Amino acid sequence: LVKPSETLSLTCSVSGESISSGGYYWTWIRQHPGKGLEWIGNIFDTGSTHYSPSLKTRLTISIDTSKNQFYLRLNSATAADTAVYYCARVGYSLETDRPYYFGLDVWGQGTTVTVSS
Amino acid sequence: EFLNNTEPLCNVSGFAIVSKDNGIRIGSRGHVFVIREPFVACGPTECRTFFLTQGALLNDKHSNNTVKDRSPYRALMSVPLGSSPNAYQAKFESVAWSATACHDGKKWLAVGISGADDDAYAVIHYGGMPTDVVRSWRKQILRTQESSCVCMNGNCYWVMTDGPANSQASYKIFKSHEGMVTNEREVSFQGGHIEECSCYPNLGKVECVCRDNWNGMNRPILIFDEDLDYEVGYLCAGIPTDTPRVQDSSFTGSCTNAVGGSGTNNYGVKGFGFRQGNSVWAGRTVSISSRSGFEILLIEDGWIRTSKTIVKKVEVLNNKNWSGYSGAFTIPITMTSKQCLVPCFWLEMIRGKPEERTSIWTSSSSTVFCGVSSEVPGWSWDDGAILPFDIDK
Amino acid sequence: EFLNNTEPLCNVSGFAIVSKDNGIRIGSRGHVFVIREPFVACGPTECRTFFLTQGALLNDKHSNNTVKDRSPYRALMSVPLGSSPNAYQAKFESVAWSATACHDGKKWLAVGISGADDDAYAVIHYGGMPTDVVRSWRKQILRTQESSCVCMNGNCYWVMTDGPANSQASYKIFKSHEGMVTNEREVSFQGGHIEECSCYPNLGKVECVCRDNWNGMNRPILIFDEDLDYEVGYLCAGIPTDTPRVQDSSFTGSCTNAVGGSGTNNYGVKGFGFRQGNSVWAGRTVSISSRSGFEILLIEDGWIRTSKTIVKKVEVLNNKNWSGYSGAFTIPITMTSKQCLVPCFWLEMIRGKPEERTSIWTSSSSTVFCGVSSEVPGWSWDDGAILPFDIDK
Amino acid sequence: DIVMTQSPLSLPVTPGEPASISCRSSQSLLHSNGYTYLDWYLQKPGQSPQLLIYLASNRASGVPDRFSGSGSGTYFTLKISRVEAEDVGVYYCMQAVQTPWTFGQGTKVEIK
Ligand SMILES: *[C@@H]1O[C@H](CO)[C@@H](O)[C@H](O)[C@H]1NC(C)=O
Ligand SMILES: *[C@@H]1O[C@H](CO)[C@@H](O)[C@H](O)[C@H]1NC(C)=O
Ligand SMILES: *[C@@H]1O[C@H](CO)[C@@H](O)[C@H](O)[C@H]1NC(C)=O
Ligand SMILES: *[C@@H]1O[C@H](CO)[C@@H](O)[C@H](O)[C@H]1NC(C)=O
Ligand SMILES: [Ca+2]
Ligand SMILES: [Ca+2]
């Protein structure tokens, strides 16, 4: 449980693979009760980051390659930030002369964050 | 009788032009295919321009989305050196969206990769019939080297790779006798990325100068021989040669480590580099951040010594003109009767939507040069098309 | 020296793609013929795509009625494997509106039926000259297998039929030697229909899997040898493999009797089936009521045992793409140096007015596959033409 | 963002028959490098989502051979050749063209 205007944070872990193996982007993905999915942001193995604009003022997302772990922090959580939070992986690249995309192929189990007193 | 190549590479002093497709210039009215990347390979009777068509002709409506570089419609065909890639003289070779080909003295071997992204496989043609198949092993995009394979004492060799683009992959060296594969050995190389090599034989060792698509401004080298023992490392030169790079005075160079830069780390372009004793004839694009122009540099002791002393420079495109991939090949003894192998290189010039936003298609055109013991001058032998074409209107 | 074929068929584990015409996709601006049905046949030097042109190019006003499948203008022409069926590479072989052709080790043989509906006759060309003529005997539409003939020890064999389409006909087995016919025997088969066979040799017998166009969901089998003794009956498999069919769990199968259906009784499609010991690699469309999508199924003991156990399945077109005929051939020892015959098959993809009502013409495009001992995956190697064409506007 | 809209909010269905769901985006999903970045994902009762189709046309690995995809530009479709009892769930489209990825509204599939 999280109380309003606290800092939410979450831990996601990797195994079988390692972080910095396979060149995936690690993603956080949200789901409010009764609604459809939403996308929070991407980290690459080397720390370059993408954020959804609606949350970009609140967020901070980071890796620790020595722990095979990656992290979400969301400042000033409102009651409306109540959701199931999923973490995933997705391999893709757009620079090269042979692009690819293998969308969100593996999902972790969800965490039901409830933001209330 | 099988083609030897156990003979040294010729010393050369300048590179003279040999052929020029004029593909796009003729294709404005003639029936000419859309090509993303070409290459050249030489048999004992002739040299032939291979290319990966996109199954459609210029100015034809089926050329619309030809920026897309992998699809079930691409095919490898082959046209004799210098003739345009026209619809009626192109001999079909393979179905393929990434290939390699070379002549072993008896018959033409071609390797054509096909199948879906996550499950690709290669079919090894030999004289017009499929003799073997190699499937992915990491089950991401499988790739061959986009230029000829290297045949010696009747065995033909090539490098293939499976895995990420912007991160460490898996790379394997292959070996075939009369089509079918007889050996395969993986390159353990934890510091870098060997994607799109350009290979040539030299006194019994196959040498390859490749494409570092991760954390590097500098060319990886791979050297291997009869039974696939190898050495891996980097082109020591003090002069960087990939497309994204910082200027020559800022780079320091390394023989064993990938040297990265500001904004240069996740991109590159296919090149070549002929060793000449300890010096190297390294080809590179004039601009430091885009595929334009082309230079050939003879760097003294650049194969081993982090030197920056450029002894000779040629130019074959000036910086206002678009260029692209470049690769190596050699013209055998059976042709020239010299007691050594003559080094040659090709250069493609790309035109279309990746830079010229208004055109819908994307195609390229080839120019071919060969080494000459005399000194030779440079000039801008550009592609000379006048876009937009009549289907872009 | 004549081409042997007294050698066993090769055991295969999956089929790898070999070529793809891209005929319609190139024919939009190129000069490409309209074709209804193609096929492939292999000599000792090369394999060639044969096809029955309709005397007119794509995207041209003389294609306004090519759904009409018999006319004086049709002609059989031949192009090396994988090159488009264009106007300037095609070598003329025979005036014909239904034909078969095969290389006997010395020269190409090609049988071209022509003449009016009620009075047709076949011309047997051999090395470019008419050696013999075979006339109708029931005086309705004379027919041949629209796919290669089978040559052994110098003799060449094929199956012809004369008589009704939705009712019992007359079927005959022929045997040439250097062009002219030497022998002829009639297939007595009161229970069924054998229209449009796909034949291949196998250890000195010729095996054909055919097309039941009357009261049958199931393939007829014909097996004959040197002096034309034969066995007739049906592909025992518990899996039905004609186009009109009931689903696999409703069908029961028979080795000797035509198993009909609800609404499936008077129509069909040309197809193939390689025996592999007692199992069969049977090809069939994906849909049970229309010519769309293609599968290849290895059925265990399917050749003899009414079994339904599909051991392997491959797909080469997905169900949203139109398909068509299909047929067997084999690549000889003279090419592969294997001590066994490599099995291969072709698939045609029809486009135009029989299903796409708005276009005026009707043409088809060829894909060719060959068997490989490795496992090989599937994909949707479809035809990719953005119809309608400019002549349709 | 690309606004995503998806036409049946619930689809009644029954085993053995074909079925279809479809999707439309407020700009064409044709990226400048030629590929068309649209996916479909399936969320079964009390589970995470699962990948079905990873570009307009391409099925993912391990997905049963019964699904099929089609479309280009703005309008895309998911086909089920025969529906079977394991297919109940909520189906979302997704697009991966722009820097914010957006999911569809979510078609429920209800057996009848
Ligand atoms: C190939 O090389 C060997 C080794 O020197 C030589 O003796 C042989 O004659 C060569 N053959 C040809 C055809 O060049
Ligand atoms: C190319 O295709 C796009 C749709 O993908 C279309 O907007 C455009 O008009 C087409 N142009 C031509 C010349 O076919
Ligand atoms: C054909 O077959 C016979 C019988 O096996 C064999 O002896 C003969 O040498 C063969 N000829 C050719 C040309 O392959
Ligand atoms: C084809 O033929 C019909 C008459 O049989 C005619 O009405 C039509 O205009 C013709 N179409 C073309 C494209 O010539
Ligand atoms: Ca680089
Ligand atoms: Ca039938």
Residue numbers in the entry:
A (entry chain N): 1 to 117
B (entry chain G), C (entry chain D): 0 to 392
D (entry chain O): 1 to 112
Which sentences did the original study use to describe this structure?
Influenza neuraminidase (NA) is a glycoprotein present on the virion surface that facilitates nascent virus egress by cleaving sialosides from cell surface glycoproteins and glycolipids. Cryo-electron microscopy structures of two NCS mAbs revealed that they rely on structural mimicry of sialic acid, the substrate of NA, by coordinating not only amino acid side chains but also water molecules, enabling inhibition of NA activity across multiple influenza A and B viruses, including avian influenza clade 2.3.4.4b H5N1 viruses.
To explore how NCS.1.x mAbs recognize other subtype NA subtypes, we performed cryoEM analysis of NCS.1 in complex with an N5 NA (DB16), one of the probes used during initial B cell sorting. cryoEM 2D class averages and preliminary 3D reconstructions showed that NCS. A resulting 3.36 Å cryoEM structure of the fully occupied NA-Fab complex revealed that the binding of NCS.1 to the N5 catalytic pocket closely resembles that of NCS.1.1 to N1, with similarities not only in the targeted epitope but also in the approach angle of the Fab to the catalytic site. This similarity in epitope recognition and binding orientation suggests a largely conserved mode of interaction within the NCS.1 family, optimized for engaging the catalytic pocket across NA subtypes. Comparative analysis of N1- and N5-bound structures reveals that NCS.1.x mAbs achieve breadth partly through water-mediated interactions that adapt to subtype-specific residue variations in the catalytic pocket. Specifically, position 344 differs: DB16/N5 has a bulky Tyr, while CA09/N1 has a smaller Asn. The absence of Y344 in CA09/N1 leaves a void which is effectively filled by two ordered H2O molecules. We additionally demonstrated that all NCS.1.x mAbs demonstrated ELLA inhibition activity against recombinant N5 DB16, confirming our ELISA binding data.
